[PDB]
């Protein structure tokens, strides 16, 4: 089976500059078997280049392709604000036809620190038999961040869930919410609930906590 | 310009079989070199080609999934039916039907081929749990005076099935900073998300906060009040 | 599957020869059968093919003067070479094409051992034996070499031994080289310590079978 | 007329490492390429069929890939008995066009070593009939590459030398070399001093070994 | 001008053979080229001629069964002899007719070295070696002779030596004579003083190359 | 059919003197006659063209004259390397009639000498298979002419003798001769005494050399 | 060049007997190339035989020829008194065509002694500055004779001239006159002038002299 | 019967050129096989062939003299002209033109060829000295009484050029024994001869002796008196 590896895994470039994407094939096939597709946020993928050098109909001249043997590249000369999406290389060489893992083009910006906020469960959720406390990290760049949960200053692992949102349409920052779910035997068996956050925009990790009893 | 639309059961029970019908317009399954392909994208993963049927009723399937995948065509009704049996919970994905075509030029030189227009896509899930209305728990701004007028407040919609739930803050009069994070599959094959809004602490007790949460498969229309809770 | 060869030798240019390939466990008439030649020191070259139906094809160099045939009665393949020239000196292999369990179409899966064909007017004769003594030095690191030069013979192979096989360690025989005069020569050297130069008398024995030359020549250093 | 080349001409490899050898066609040949292995003194053996299919009975360490104009044969764990010559043959052109590749040789890799360099004169017995052979012998040198030149009173002797090289031994995996000049009686009798200059990777500087006709 | 011959040997009567004449510095097609044969012990006899324009002529004895041709590509002259009979045993010369600086019209100015052609059913075999001792006398003027009789062999030449070449003075080898049985024989004698009859042991060595006979036989007087 | 004869068949000459050899045709051939010289073991060399024209590169001591039916080749100073066989060839008859002459042999002349006359019996070893050879050897006789006859108890043995003669040596310029009788076992075993009679110009009277079967 | 040598150089035979002449050629040519011509005293040569055996027209049967190879002969069976002349052999074999040196046929007779007479110069020749004295030998046979001049009994050489006449028409003898020319410095520097004559008809040479002063 | 006559300059100066014309009658230079040859005879030497011209204007010359000898024919006037250049004193000779012919007989067998009638001959000399009348010196019978009536008396004609001089003794009344020896080329390329008569001493003073010597090229007509001179 032919395996296509894209590079880089993630890519961030502010509008105006040059975008380069690479796709390397495990086996060797004709250069006319490889195409490039672009898929935007929550959209069906659309054809971008076929034959590794033949631009699709209607695609602007900003997209070009160059292929040789087991090395293919997609070049974007002028990249506009509407040109940030995920890019897949796929082959028609051997069955089954396989796509690449993709490459997310990102809108670059200056580094910002995430506001870290904490929200406890409601009385209804103290009534449901399962209580979740949500820890939010907002307005940060880049996407990379780490959060660790502490029940009475004791590290938690395997008992929390994560959800990071997509890039905003106006500020290009990221947001993230992580929930910690427990029962009453755990929620009323301790006092302290804390998030410690490690971000590239923060020189030192920040530990922020709350106590159910005091409030 | 050509279009393709998928339809079928978006709620498929485990170890059962689904049938998906793609109706296409702008072309017919009679032109040489024209085919209909079925591709799937798992949530958060890369694409995976499933099947491809040609104009001369020649069909190709992925060898790792050809034992349980059947593809049929109806040129009269311009339809393509994909039947897939023996479902597993990891088969949940979004399924596209796409137009497949090649480009020869006056000498049969084959300047490549492509998957041109893809269908809108049907999000099909494989699970046992049935529908369930979401439980809404309001998430309270913390006890802070000003903090530079920076705060966030939300509501958590948890234990609902299936996707999706639509959240609106103050009926469109509060959309500045409304983050509706993508819902996460709970450990029990169930869904839970948080919807929050970034607001200034200088307008805590004077600006109303509501979240109208909606879920058609469970017909859940709950207008949950969010209010500041002190100590 | 066994393919046993026969018919090699040495011939004058413009001569003729016949090569035989007796197969077992397969049928020569029922398979694509090829003759493939390889010159000494060069790569493989396809020579001829015969189809199961009797159709034959040849490479361009051997058109006309080479023919391929089969005998069904005893399941043999035959190659008749006529008007042989010097460029035909090679090892010839009988191979079965488009076989193998995964059915390697167009590939040779079963090979014979090949026969040797030589085409030269060398006028078969005997090799002269010349001794080679090292530099007249005392120890020089305890490394001396003595050699037997075997000259002016045709054809190969020849046997070179030291003390009639009593010495076998450190002996290096070099492959014979085709002289511009159509003869062959080689050198068989061996390294011994200088302290053993005197106490161990050495003799180089050259047995050239086709010319029946049994020559044993003494190997001792010289006085300068 | 499908020209077929192999890269590299010869590579030296250790035991157990992965090795890849490439075969290139003058034009695309789809997957009509086969890989054969031939040990010295033996007939070739078919390893890879259709440029990707392993043959029955061939160890799984041999694999083949590629298509069109570029093909590759890859060995994962190069066993000590995998040292042979590998040929790529195409079956694409015509029933009269089954050309073979040049061939790739795989041999054991070891540490560099300096040869013993000896000069052997034309002995009187062979000289008595006007046929003089002079020998420059290089003993136990690795790698195979070496340069030998012939010197006569600072003059350069070229165009009549013969080179005989032994293949790698099973004991020390080195090489041996002999360079021979053949001359008639007066093509040696007049001249005075005869030397051989040698150049090897394992030697920092070329070495000259000279002997006098007059002295011995 | 060089004319190099090739193609001689021995053949059975009624056989065939081809002789080649490779010229240099002249063109075979542009000259009158002749084949002229000479029997061993007899005079020259003109055999065939080919004109510059390709016309050919033959002597009466070889009409029909002899043909002459040329190859322009490599400038050679060819003589194909068929139905060979015993009267064709001779040395054949490739000659250029009507040349020379003063333009010797009708004369042969450039000659090849000639090839030897033998036509007999002698059934090639080996020579027997017989010693010959002189009269049992004391001195008789100090003149005795000892000989080696070489008998019953085909074909020529043979090598006869005394003491493996250690004796070369006074040795007389006589030309071999064609026996009525189709074999060859000769005698190689040498005169030595009688006083050296005893103190000098003698051995006659006969090396017949085509039959590979290497026979050394002792040569000493007898007791009567 | 132009018969062509040479006179004399062979002449003996010294060094430096003038020698003339004549060639005669059965009918007049104008001047279409050529003189060739051939040394033993070599190919003929054209000396004289058109019976009067010296060839280029031929020493001036060779001259040719005559016409019609009589022609002559004359050498002024017969050098030591001029001893060879001389042929006259006509180019008059027809393209299929280039007949050659018999040939004239020129050899060194010296003083007469008597040969050693020896008789060699049929040795027992060769006799053991019924094949007996008896030899009469004449050593160092000049000139070439000699007569040899075979005697058995006054009987005359004729019709089965073989003569082997050596050409003139470069040391003494003499000749050697061997006469051989081959007989089957009983074609010798019954008879008693075997003799050889020899006659030479350098000998006043013929000499008989006899040996007894019974004695040895 | 073909050279024809005749023999003998001189030939004397009284009428009635057999005349034989020989001509030998350096090279060999056909016998039909050689002819014989006869030239009389002060006459143009006339053809005698052509083809070496074919008698010319009008020539009497007394002349015959016989030729073979390089030897030719002319035979005269009956030779008459009018048949004494010079005979040339010539060839038409190779250019240039060459004649023989000739052969003078002589009228034989008995031997006679030459009268020896001396005549001094005239006074006019003592006036001319050069004086010649003439010595005459007459009526002798054969043609061979020798005369030596002596001035005061001293031998003279290189200062005299000779002139012998042809055979007479009636007596077949010969005559000869030899002149000695000197100047006055030589004619009046001596006394004796002598001829000594050696002839086949004289047993001893005869010395006869004169003195200018006495007469 | 055929005739040939030569004409030209009999007095040729050295290193100059002469032209000789042979007029022939009885035949014409048109018959096949007919030629005109020129031969020369030096005084007292053998003949030497000079040139030969054929009926078809084919000419042959002596190779040693072909570089300076030209031969031409005029069939209309029946003439042959020989021009010879670069004269030497040794070229003095008598030149004949002769008829050359061959004899074939009905089968072209060539029964030989010949030089049949020769011309009368022209005596041509090569010298520098011009004409000169002869000097006549009478040669006196010696002082003898009888001597058996045997004596000779003459006159010497010396230093004359060119040939010849005619001597008559007593106007034809004394011809018995008149020897006129052939003239000898003097060392200076000049001519001198003696004319003597054998007479008896018994008629010395009673028989008149005269020699009329004549030389047309010098017009010398001298009637020299010979008389006995005593002591």
Numbering used by the authors:
A (entry chain J), G (entry chain L): 1 to 215
B (entry chain I), H (entry chain H): 1 to 231
C (entry chain R), E (entry chain M): 2 to 225
D (entry chain S), F (entry chain N): 1 to 216
Sentences from the paper on this structure:
To explore the molecular basis of their epitopes, we next determined the cryo-EM structures of these two bnAbs in complexed with S-trimer of prototype (resolution 2.65 Å), Omicron BA.2 (resolution 2.75 Å), and BA.4/5 (resolution 2.85 Å), respectively. Notably, an S-trimer bound three pairs of fragments antibody-binding (Fabs) of L4.65 and L5.34 in its open state without steric clash. Three Fab pairs engaged three up RBDs with the same binding mode in different S-timers. L5.34 and L4.65 interact with the inner and outer face of the RBD, respectively. The footprint of L5.34 locates at the typical RBD-2 site towards RBD peak, largely overlapping with the RBM, while the footprint of L4.65 is at the typical RBD-5 site beneath the mesa in the outer face of RBD. The epitopes of L5.34 harbor more mutations in Omicron BA.2 (D405N, K417N, S477N, T478K, E484A, Q493R, N501Y, and Y505H) and BA.4/5 (D405N, K417N, S477N, T478K, E484A, F486V, N501Y, and Y505H), compared with the epitopes of L4.65 (N440K and 498R) in both Omicron sub-variants. This explained the largely decreased binding affinity of L5.34, but not L4.65, to RBD of Omicron BA.2 or BA.4/5, when compared with its binding to prototype RBD. We demonstrate that the binding affinity of RBD-2-directed mAb L5.34 to RBD of Omicron BA.2 or BA.4/5 strains has a huge reduction (1–2 orders of magnitude) compared with that to prototype RBD. However, despite this reduction, the binding affinity (KD of 1.67E−10 M and 4.07E−10 M to bind BA.2 and BA.4/5, respectively) remains relatively high. The high affinity is still effective in efficiently preventing the viral infection.
